Amino acid sequence: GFVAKDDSLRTFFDAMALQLKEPVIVSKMAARKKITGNFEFHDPNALLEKLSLQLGLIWYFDGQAIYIYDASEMRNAVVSLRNVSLNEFNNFLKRSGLYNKNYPLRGDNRKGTFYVSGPPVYVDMVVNAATMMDKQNDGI
């Protein structure tokens, strides 16, 4: 528990992380925001979702660490996907547990690209995954 009084987001999320196994990595732009209020950390993921909406943040848990960015650091990507169905690629991300429902792949089965917008660490993964998968399927 924690009563914040104009504390930097970095200090705040460090406080949240005390009761977590994973470190929290707060971007430069997120860290310059301040936060005030009475906080209880009885449900960190729910809090993260709410604060991301209140304060204009985006976040990703990659299974080992939590990344927090300002909404202004959102990466907007267009990604080629020529040799695999969008649905196959989606399921692949999901099964692997890297997919984040807050940052969905936006495409259609007619065209050879899809869009994705979200935390840089996430989008970088999505782009790499699509690039690896497209190549490995580039054949009869």
From Swiss-Prot:
Subunit-level organization: The core secretion machinery of the T3SS is composed of approximately 20 different proteins, including cytoplasmic components, a base, an export apparatus and a needle. This subunit is part of the base, which anchors the injectisome in the bacterial cell envelope. Forms a stable homooligomeric complex. The complex is composed of 15 subunits.
Disruption of the gene: reported phenotype: Insertion mutants are hypoinvasive in the HEp-2 cell assay.
Homology family: Belongs to the bacterial secretin family. T3SS SctC subfamily.
Any GO MF annotation of the entry: identical protein binding
GO annotation (BP), single: protein secretion
Entry GO CC: cell outer membrane; type II protein secretion system complex; type III protein secretion system complex
Major place of residence: membrane
Lineage of source species: Bacteria, Pseudomonadati, Pseudomonadota, Gammaproteobacteria, Enterobacterales
Protein name listed in UniProt: SPI-1 type 3 secretion system secretin
Location of the protein in the cell: Cell outer membrane
Organism: Salmonella typhimurium (strain LT2 / SGSC1412 / ATCC 700720)
